[PDB]
Amino acid sequence: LPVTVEKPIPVVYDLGNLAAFDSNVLDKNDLDSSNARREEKIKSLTRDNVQLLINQLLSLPMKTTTESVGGTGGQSSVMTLLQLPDPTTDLPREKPLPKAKAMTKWEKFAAKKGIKPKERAGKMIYDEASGEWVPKWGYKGANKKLDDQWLVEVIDPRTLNRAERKRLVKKNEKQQRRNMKN
Amino acid sequence: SSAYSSRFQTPFRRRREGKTDYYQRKRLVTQHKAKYNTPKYRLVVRFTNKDIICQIISSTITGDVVLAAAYSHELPRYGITHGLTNWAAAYATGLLIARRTLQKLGLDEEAVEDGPRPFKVFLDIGLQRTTTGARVFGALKGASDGGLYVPHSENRFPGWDFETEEIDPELLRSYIFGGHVSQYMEELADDDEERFSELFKGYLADDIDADSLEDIYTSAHEAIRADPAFKPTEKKFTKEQYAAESKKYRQTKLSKEERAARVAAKIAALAGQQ
C-alpha cells in the first residue's frame, strides 16, 4: 500500500541495464552467517531497490505503433514498448576491431593514376544474331562461346583458348597470394 | 565389446523414446530471438486412437507448465457422443480450447497501461506429418475460429488446390458438418448393411440420419459456445484406495539377505558337482 522509498544516500542507475548500484551501507549483525532470520533482511533491503527500479522504468518514455496482422517488422497496435536509455556500463569486447587496411598493388596504382572505381551496373550483355541477352558470365557466359562454336577458321584451336583462359585465371589467383603476404 | 558398451553417448530420455523432436523444439524455443522480450506460448496437439489432445503450453526452467487443455471426451456433455476423432471432432476440440481459454482468462462477459492485447499462440505439431486436409489443421481452424489468434496459412485445409491458388469453401463446409462421413454413409447404405451394420453401430442404436447428424453438429457448436466450464469428473473411489490396489498388484524388490540366500543355495547346490 505504501509506494515510495527513501534512503539517506540515493542510489545510482544504469537504466539500459535495468540495474541499480548502491552506495548505502549494510549491517553485519543483520546478515551474519550465524543468523537464522537472515534472508528476511536481503528481502527487506532489495524489495525497496526493485521498487525504485520499476519506479524508474515506468517513468520512461515509450513507443507505440499502428500496425496489423503479419507485422514483419515489430510490435503491433496492442503492444507498447518502453525506450531505454543506452548503457553506460563500459564492459569489454571479445575480439578486436576488424581493420584490414592495406592497398595491395592495385588501390595504390589507381590512386597514383586517375582511375575511378567503376559503376557496377549489370551482369548481362546483348547478343547480336541472335537477339537474346545471354550474360557475359553467371550463366552460359559469352566467354565459353568459342567452346561450342562449330567451325573456327584456322593443335586444336579451342584447347589453346581454354589454356590461355586458365593461364590468366591462375596469374590472378597467384597475385592474390602475393598481395596477401606482403 | 565392453569398450563398445562403454565408449558411446546416448540420446536423451524422450529421444530414446519416440515422443519429442528436440530440433523442432529448439526452433520453437529460441523465438526470434534478437528483437524484444515477449514470452512465447504454444498449442500442442496430438492424435491417437480414441483421443484428440490439445493444450496451451508455457515453458520454464522447471521445464513446462500447462495453462489450459482439452480432451476429445468432454463432448458428450455438450452433445457429441459419436466419432470422437474425425475432422469435426477436431474442430470441436479446438473450438472448446479456444472458448475455454478466453472465458477462463476473462476477455468478454504489470501491463497496466494498455490493453486487450489479443492472445498469441504457435501451433506445435509434434512428430505429426503435414499433409493437405488433415485433422490437426482441422483443430487449428477450429481454434482460430473460436477466437484465438494463431498465425497460420490457407493451403493446409481440406479442399485447397495445388493446381492454382484457391480454397473451395464448399468442401470445407461439408467437412465441418460431417458431409464427408454422411456421403460415405449414403454410399454404403444404398448398397450394403453388413459393413453398414458393423460401422455406425451406435448410429443404429440411436437411429441417426445424415441431415440429423449435420443438425447435431450445428447444435453442438453453439453448445460448446454456451458453457465451456471444465469441471472435473466427480472422483469416485479415490486416490488412496487406487494406490492400495495398485500396490497389491505391483511387484517389489528384495534385500541383501535374500540375495545372499539365493547365491548360497545356488553355489552350494548346482556348483558342488550337481
Next chain:
Amino acid sequence: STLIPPPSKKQKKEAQLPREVAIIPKDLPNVSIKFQALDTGDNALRVPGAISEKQLEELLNQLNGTSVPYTFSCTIKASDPYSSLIKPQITLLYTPRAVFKVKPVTRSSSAIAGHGSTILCSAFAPHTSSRMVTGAGDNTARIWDCDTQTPMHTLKGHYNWVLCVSWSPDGEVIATGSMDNTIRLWDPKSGQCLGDALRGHSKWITSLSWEPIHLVKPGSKPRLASSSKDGTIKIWDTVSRVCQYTMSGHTNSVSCVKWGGQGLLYSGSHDRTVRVWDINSQGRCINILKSHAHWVNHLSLSTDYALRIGAFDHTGKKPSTPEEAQKKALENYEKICKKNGNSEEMMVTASDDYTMFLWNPLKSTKPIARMTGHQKLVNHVAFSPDGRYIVSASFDNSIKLWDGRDGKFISTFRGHVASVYQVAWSSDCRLLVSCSKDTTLKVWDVRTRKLSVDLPGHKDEVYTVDWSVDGKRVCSGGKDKMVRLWTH
C-alpha cells in the same frame, strides 16, 4: 523507406539521466468544484482532499442513489477531460456512458470466396452477429455464416445487378432492390422466392427503408419504402405484395430516402432540395427545403441506430410477445429521443457544394447551422449512436468530425490517400471505422481524435463496410471479388 531522424549526442545524455518519479504524494488542497450536466442540468461547492475519477463516479451515484459511471470534463480551452490540476473553483461536467465496451478491430480472418464479380453492398443481421448478407455486382446475392466463414444458402432470383440490400428491423426480411427496377424479399433461413418480385418502378432501384418497430400495431407486419431514379418513393406492404401509394415531389433523381421516427419520411434528390412527407395524410408533402447549391446525396437522420436495430439489444434476448417487442422499441427509442428531456431528432444533409446542413423538421424550414470546410464533394455522413456527434466522409482523403448538437467543428481524421467512400460508427460510440478508394481500411479513436489501426489486405479498392450490431466483426468487400471479416 524514409526514416525518422535519429537523436543527437546531447539528446542521448538527456536520456541517460533520471526522470520524473510521480507519486501524487501528499496531496491535500482545500479544493472547490461545481457539478454540471450538458443539456441543462447542474446538480455543490465543497472542500475535499483528493479523489479518483472512478470515485467521482461512485460519489455521484451515491448522491443520486442510482444503486453507471460517467466521463468527467473540466473547464469547458480544447475541453480537456490531481490528473486534471497538473497541466496548468473548477467547473466539472458529468456525462453518462451506457457502459458496454468491446475490443477494437485489429486482426483479420481470411478472404471468403464465392461469386465472381465486384461486390457492391453489404449488411449484417440486426438480431445475430453471426449472419451477414451481401449483394454483389453479379446477378445474385449471398448469405454467409460468419462463425466458420463459409457461405450458406446461396441465394438467386434477380436478373440484373443487385444494387441495394436491406434487412428488416425484426429479422425476417432481406430486401434486394435490383438494377432491374424491382425488389425481391428473402427468407434468412431457407432462401426461397417469396411469391415473386415487387414490380412497379421504371428506372433502376436505388435505396430502401423500413417502418420502425414503435410504429406498427403489435401483431402486424412492417412496411418498406423504395426509391428509384424515377423521382418518386413507392411504399410497399410486406404481405399485400402490391404498392400502396407513391409520393412524387422531386423531378430529378431521388438519391436516398429514410423513414423517420415520428411517422414522417425524408427524401433528398438531385433537385438541390430536401422534402419532408407525412404518411398518415396518405403520403403528402409538407416542407420543401431549398438551401443547397448542387444536388443532395445521402441524407441522414439522428436516431437511425434505434430506427435500425429493431428492438434487438446489444445482447440478443429475442422477443417473447409482440407487446414485449413494442415496449423494447419504446424504451430503446426514448433512451436517445428526449436527450435534453424534449423529444428531438435532427437531420443532416450532405451535397456537392462542399457544405452540409443541419435540419430540425419539427421546428421550421430554416436550418440551424451550415458546416463548411471540405474541398471535394461530400459523399457520406453519419450521426453518432448517442446522437452526440456527426461525422462526414468526403472525396479529398479526409474525414471531418463535428459537434452533433449545435453543428460546430472539432477535428479532422487524416491518413487516407485516395477518396473516402463510407464510414461506420461503433456500436458503443467508441471507435469509428472507415473504408476508402485506396487498398487499406482504417479505424479511429474518437476520444483523443487519432488513428488506432490501419489494416490492408485487399487486391483492389473497397466499396462496402459495416460494423456489427454488438461490436464483434466488421465486414468488407469490393472490386477484388472477396469478402473479408475483421475482428479483434
Next chain:
Amino acid sequence: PMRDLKIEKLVLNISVGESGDRLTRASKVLEQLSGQTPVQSKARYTVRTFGIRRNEKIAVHVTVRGPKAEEILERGLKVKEYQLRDRNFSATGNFGFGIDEHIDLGIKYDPSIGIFGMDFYVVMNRPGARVTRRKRCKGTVGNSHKTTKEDTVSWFKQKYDADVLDK
C-alpha cells in the same frame, strides 16, 4: 491366437543389366502378369565383366502384397511341382526361388517379347511389425514374437504340400 504366418510380400525381380529393349520386355511381362508399374534399378559401380557402368539400369522388380500376392505365390509354387529345399529359407523365416519360361504361370509364348522369368521372393512374418515400421514410438520386436525358420517351414509343409528335399 496371434502368432500367425500371414503372407506379407512377394517381390518378382529380373536383373538383366541391359539398357535396351529386353528390359522393356521384362517390364511389360511384369505389367501383364502383376499389373502394377515396375520399378527400375541401377548399378553401383563398374566391374568390366558383368557389362555395367554407374547407374546402368540393370534390374527391375515389382512388389505385390495381399491376396494377389498370395495368388502369384501359389501359382509359382505349383510350377516348381511343390519341391522346395531345406535351404532357400532365410534364418529369419522367408524364402525364394526361380523359374524360367514365364509361360509357366500367366502369359503365353508371344515371341514379340522373347522369354524370361520372375526371380521370386516371399517375405513372411507374424503380425506386429508396426513398431518396427512406424514413425512415432519406433522400437524393436521381441525374440518371443520374432519368427524363425523351422516353424514357418512347418507352416509351409502345410497347405500346398511341398516335398522334403533333403530334410
Next chain:
Amino acid sequence: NARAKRALVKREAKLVENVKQALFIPGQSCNKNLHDIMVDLSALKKPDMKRFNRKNDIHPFEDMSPLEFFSEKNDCSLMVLMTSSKKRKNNMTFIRTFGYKIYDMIELMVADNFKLLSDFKKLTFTVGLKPMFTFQGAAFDTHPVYKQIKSLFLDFFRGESTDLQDVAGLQHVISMTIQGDFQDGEPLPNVLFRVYKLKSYKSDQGGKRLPRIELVEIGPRLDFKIGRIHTPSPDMVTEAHKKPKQKKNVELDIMGDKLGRIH
C-alpha cells in the same frame, strides 16, 4: 560447403558483437553438489551455452594453453571451471577471455548451505528472458576485486541488448550484496546471490501508475567466497575497451533539414 564460410563470417570480429557464448568445462574433482550447482547455473544461459561431458585435468592459475585452446575451439568468451579439492572445497574458476587471451580469472568458493532449483517453492519461469540486476553495499564503486566480479557477472548474465523493452518480460531479479560492512586491510566478506521472481499488486495510493512488489525465491541461493584473482595487461585493457567509431554549429532538426548557426 558454403555453410563452412557462414561459420567463419559468424566468427568474424563484428562491429558491435553478438550474444556471449559461455562454456562449462568439468575439472578433475567433482561431486553431486558441485555438478548440480553448475547445472542450476547453466539453467540461465540457455539457449546460448555449451557444456563438456567428460572431465579434464586443467589448472587455471598454473598453465594457460588448454584454456585458450578451449575458448577458441568453442568461440566462447566466458569459461566456467567446476572443480574441488581438500585444499579448496568446491572452487569455481570464472574466466573472461578477450581475443583468445585471458582477460581475467577469479576463484570463488560456494558455502555448505547451498540450494538447488528444487529447494524452494518452484514458481514458474520462461526459457530465455532478460534478467534484472540489483547491487548492494558501498564497496562496488572503489573496491578493485569487487569491480571485477561485478563487471564479470554483468557480462555473464545480461545476455543481449536492445532499445525496446516490453513490459511483461520483467519476471525475475538478481540480488547481490556483500557480507556486512568491512574496512580495508581486514579480510574480504562474502558476496551473495539471490534469484527472485517479482510480482505486482495494485496500491490504490499511487494510482494506476506504480503498483507494489513482492518477491519470492525459486532457486538457487548462493554465498561466494573470493580467493585468487587475475589482472589483465594495461595495453590489452585499453585495446579491449575501445569505441567503434560508428559537426560544430551544425544540427539536425526534425525532417532532416541540416541547419547551421551564424553567430
Next chain:
RNA sequence: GAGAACAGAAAUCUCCAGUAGAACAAAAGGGUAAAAGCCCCCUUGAUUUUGAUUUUCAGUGUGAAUACAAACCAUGAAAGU
C-alpha cells in the same frame, strides 16, 4: 550372416547386427541424427534509399565505389531459416 532360376568371387534382390571406420569446399575440440549425408518440390541476388572512409572541375545534394542499417525478395502451415 542367411538365402534367392539363369549369374561365377564381385549383376540383382528380402531381413537383422549397427555411435558414424560411407560420406563433408576441414585440419585439429566434438559431432550434430527424424543430419551439416542421399533423394525430392518451389525458387533469385551485381534489388533501392541515407549517416561513416576517399575522389571529382559545374563541388557536381553523393554522381559513384565501399562499410553499416532499413524496407524488400525466396521458402515454410508455423515458430523461423
Next chain:
RNA sequence: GGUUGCGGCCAUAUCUACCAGAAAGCACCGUUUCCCGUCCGAUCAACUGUAGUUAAGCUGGUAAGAGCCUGACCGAGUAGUGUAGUGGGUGACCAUACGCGAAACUCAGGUGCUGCAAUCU
C-alpha cells in the same frame, strides 16, 4: 500406486537371457467412397470404436552379466613440481625448511530422480 500428454537432469535412465502385469489409460486391430502417396493403404492420408488377444508394444522384477554411478586418509598429504641457504656431486639430474597439488589399486555402497496437467477398481 497404475496409466496418458508436455518436459528437465540426459546410462544410477543403456545392451542381454527370462518372469510377471486387476481396473483405467494405449498399443495391437478391420476399411479404401471423401481429402491425401507410393510399385504396391506395410508409412503417411481418411473412417468407426465396430469382429480379438496379451503374442505383441509398453511397465515392473529377477541376474553378484556387460556397461555405468556415488562416497572415502582408496592409494596419498604422497608421486610430481613453483619459492629461500655453499646441499652437494665436475657432472645424467637430484639432498634441507613454506608452498601448489595427482593418478591407476583397494573398501563401503548403488542400476532413475522428478516439474506441470488429465485419468483409473
